[PDB]
Structure 1
Amino acid sequence: GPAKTMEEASKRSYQFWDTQPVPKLGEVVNTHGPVEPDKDNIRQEPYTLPQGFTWDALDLGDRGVLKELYTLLNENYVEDDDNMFRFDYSPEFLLWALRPPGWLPQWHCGVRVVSSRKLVGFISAIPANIHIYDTEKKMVEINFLCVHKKLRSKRVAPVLIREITRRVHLEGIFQAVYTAGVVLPKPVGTCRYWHRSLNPRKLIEVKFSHLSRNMTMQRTMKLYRLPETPKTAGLRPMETKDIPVVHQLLTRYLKQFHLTPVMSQEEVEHWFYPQENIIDTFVVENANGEVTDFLSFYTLPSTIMNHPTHKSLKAAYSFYNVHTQTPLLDLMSDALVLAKMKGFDVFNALDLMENKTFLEKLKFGIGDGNLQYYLYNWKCPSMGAEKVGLVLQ
């Protein structure tokens, strides 16, 4: 069973994670470097799966295979604390997240039932250059670890982790970054989700949020009402011509944080060029024609389980927001208006980077879920949320 708190986790004994090159939960880290040296010979054979299951690298270019992955995640991926909502990553979103520049087919690591061919497990890696304190490292980002509900608590997650580690090691990469809602050895940083109601009536109806102690429904709606149009001058969707300046603005802005991505210009195009129902980016082009700011949020809806009338929650997630002339609070205020305009029910954001300067003023409510950040085979001091400058899908 998984722990949600550093104090409840420190009671626990980590059978799998004790074997891994990550620091112990209790120990304090005053060093900067790999937990273990790079390996110069790597196991050539895939790790043994339980009887009746086989490895299968998923070609997400095949529409049918992509649909299989959608279904596995739609039915077996992350749920809330109370089993009321589940992530509903779209097929198109999964392509965006899993085929960035440098993606590899063998890093789309799935598990299939031998007889039926049913997809029952998945884990993924994508390449990413990561700046951690004073070191820049080629790493991978691990994401979408999923074991079918009927396969849980059978030690299948550790063989998925070890197999993707083997396949990443084969490409000469020995560090990784990943997040989780549970506590594991050992978080480099702990971030908290905050939520901004956009359609507060639907949220309360489906029990995503709740009426505050002494507030009517009519009052909750007036509180969360937003303008129909953003206020910032020159705000417009990102275009192809904005790719270099967006890359420039992002690269300089991220320097103030201690855990950041380092994106090429092609990676900036992939992660920020707007795709409807996936990623939205708006730039601020001023009176001189100069792009000075940009905001971005990605689309991640959720399934509402066991509700006869409301089936889906449309959530927007704060991505990367860079300000150099427009105040961050004005920038994020326009993000809320834009999200409201696009039919989103809620706008989610973490307390990382400078987000705490605007969360309360813009009527975000603190969430019940922490997002722990972890590094694999890298030792470094932990950092506060405001020093985390990395957002994953």
Structure 2
Amino acid sequence: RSYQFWDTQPVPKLGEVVNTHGPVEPDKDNIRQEPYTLPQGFTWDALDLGDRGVLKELYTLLNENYVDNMFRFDYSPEFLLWALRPPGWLPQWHCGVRVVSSRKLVGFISAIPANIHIYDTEKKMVEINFLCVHKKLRSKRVAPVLIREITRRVHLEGIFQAVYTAGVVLPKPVGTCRYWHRSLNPRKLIEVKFSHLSMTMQRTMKLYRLPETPKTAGLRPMETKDIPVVHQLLTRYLKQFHLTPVMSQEEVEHWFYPQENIIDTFVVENANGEVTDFLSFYTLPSTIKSLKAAYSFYNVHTQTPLLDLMSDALVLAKMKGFDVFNALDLMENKTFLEKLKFGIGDGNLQYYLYNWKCPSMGAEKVGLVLQ
């Protein structure tokens, strides 16, 4: 295969086996000050997402041009503020491309800062998300310019490694995960053709029926007082994997404190009053009118069996009106996916590091979930 752009980047080649650990190129001690040249008639713009009108341009750009062409992500403004303004976010890392004459938003890419644990190293990186080019500008080499410009802007802040994911295979995946789906409203999914029959319709609704209330004693929504223990449980739980975030307590609050229609977190508080487990999933609908999906986030278990935790996750999602519950085969999720009646999806998710050469890993050692 020929990768015009990626062959010029500090990433391992596809097919080269990696047995080393470390950067591909050194930290840069002088950085291009000038933005990379866009095609004529387009210009860079850093998007102030605290401007409601500018945020509305971005979700319009994303809702209409982002990821069989039946279902498109329907990102909401409030979800985007959550994904794009975690602790340490920078406005110049909300990199947008506008038509010069009309100022219409036609491309975007974002970086947010994360401390990343990869094997035996902890490194300050960025996470790259929401790379989007208007359908009209496609195959005009604008995506590589966006990648180069966000790289430049991240170098300016002294950061030289990134993590990112993609559905397509690029040089070179550190890990490969697969999406799985758990029908919660089987009628609706079959109607809008997201799932198909295998077996009567009546048999299917019984097959997927869930309890009306969770079975775990002491389950309840996360509260402000749970922020420390949630942070402690997560940090300890993540040590067993090989690619994980290292979150501060403020980061834990941002990513797990519940926000309606964005992020749900439930903790298990036992008969002694100690929080010993939590489950979490985010909300991301897709346009078809709409398909309400929940996405498995981070699920930590120390006293409740993981199979019971996720069973409760499905139940709460069902109760909250979601149509489907999605989850990757990473961390220990393979231990519950089949038993809890998930079906395997058709889309992969490849995980990548920029400027870090290291052996690849099984899905089960990936302990990092992005939005």
TM-score above 0.5: yes
Work out the CA distance in 2 between the residues paired with 1:49 and 1:58: 17
Work out the CA distance in 1 between the residues paired with 2:77 and 2:200: 39
Deviation of 1:291 (Å): 0.1
Work out the CA distance in 1 between the residues paired with 2:14 and 2:184: 38
Work out the CA distance in 1 between the residues paired with 2:14 and 2:321: 42
Secondary structure in structure 1 of the residue aligned to 2:300? coil
Deviation of 1:61 (Å): 0.2
Work out the CA distance in 2 between the residues paired with 1:26 and 1:334: 41
Secondary structure in structure 2 of the residue aligned to 1:271? helix
Partner of 1:150: 136
Work out the CA distance in 1 between the residues paired with 2:49 and 2:122: 30
Work out the CA distance in 2 between the residues paired with 1:148 and 1:199: 33
Does 2:213 correspond to 1:243? no
The number of equivalent residue pairs is 371
Work out the CA distance in 2 between the residues paired with 1:182 and 1:191: 12
Deviation of 1:198 (Å): 0.4
Deviation of 1:303 (Å): 0.7
CA displacement 1:238-291 (0-9 Å, x = unmatched):
000000000000000000000000000000000000000000000000000000
Deviation of 1:345 (Å): 0.3
Deviation of 1:33 (Å): 0.2
CA displacement 1:324-383 (0-9 Å, x = unmatched):
000000000000000001110000000000000000000000000100000000000000
Matches within 5 A, 1:32-181: 32-78=21-67, 82-181=68-167
**Same amino acid, percent of matched pairs:** 100
If the length of structure 1 is used for normalisation, what is the TM-score?
Answer: 0.94
Work out the CA distance in 2 between the residues paired with 1:136 and 1:142: 18
Work out the CA distance in 2 between the residues paired with 1:332 and 1:303: 26
Work out which of the residue numbers 353, 363, 386 in structure 1 matches 2:341.
363
Deviation of 1:223 (Å): 0.3
Deviation of 1:96 (Å): 0.2
CA displacement 1:54-89 (0-9 Å, x = unmatched):
0000000000000000100000000xxx00011111
Work out the CA distance in 2 between the residues paired with 1:31 and 1:211: 48
Deviation of 1:178 (Å): 0.2
Work out the CA distance in 2 between the residues paired with 1:178 and 1:47: 21
CA displacement 1:205-242 (0-9 Å, x = unmatched):
11111111xx1111110000000000100000000000
Deviation of 1:26 (Å): 1.2
Secondary structure in structure 2 of the residue aligned to 1:246? helix
Deviation of 1:167 (Å): 0.1
Work out the CA distance in 1 between the residues paired with 2:303 and 2:351: 30
Matches within 5 A, 1:198-347: 198-212=184-198, 215-304=199-288, 311-347=289-325
Work out the CA distance in 2 between the residues paired with 1:281 and 1:265: 15
Work out the CA distance in 2 between the residues paired with 1:294 and 1:142: 27
Deviation of 1:13 (Å): 0.3
Work out the CA distance in 1 between the residues paired with 2:318 and 2:353: 35
For structure 1, the 5+ residue unaligned runs are 1-11, 305-310
Work out the CA distance in 1 between the residues paired with 2:323 and 2:3: 38
Work out the CA distance in 2 between the residues paired with 1:348 and 1:298: 10
Work out the CA distance in 2 between the residues paired with 1:219 and 1:152: 45
Partner of 1:3: none
CA displacement 1:305-328 (0-9 Å, x = unmatched):
xxxxxx111100000000000000
Secondary structure in structure 2 of the residue aligned to 1:359? coil
Partner of 1:22: 11
CA displacement 1:174-204 (0-9 Å, x = unmatched):
0000000000000000000000000111111
Secondary structure in structure 1 of the residue aligned to 2:56? helix
Deviation of 1:301 (Å): 0.4
Work out the CA distance in 2 between the residues paired with 1:313 and 1:35: 42
CA displacement 1:90-113 (0-9 Å, x = unmatched):
100000000000000000000000
Work out the CA distance in 2 between the residues paired with 1:85 and 1:357: 28
For structure 2, the 5+ residue unaligned runs are none
Moved segments of 4+, more than 3 Å: none
Deviation of 1:164 (Å): 0.1
Partner of 1:387: 365
Secondary structure in structure 2 of the residue aligned to 1:192? strand
Secondary structure in structure 2 of the residue aligned to 1:71? helix
Work out the CA distance in 2 between the residues paired with 1:156 and 1:313: 31
Secondary structure in structure 2 of the residue aligned to 1:111? strand
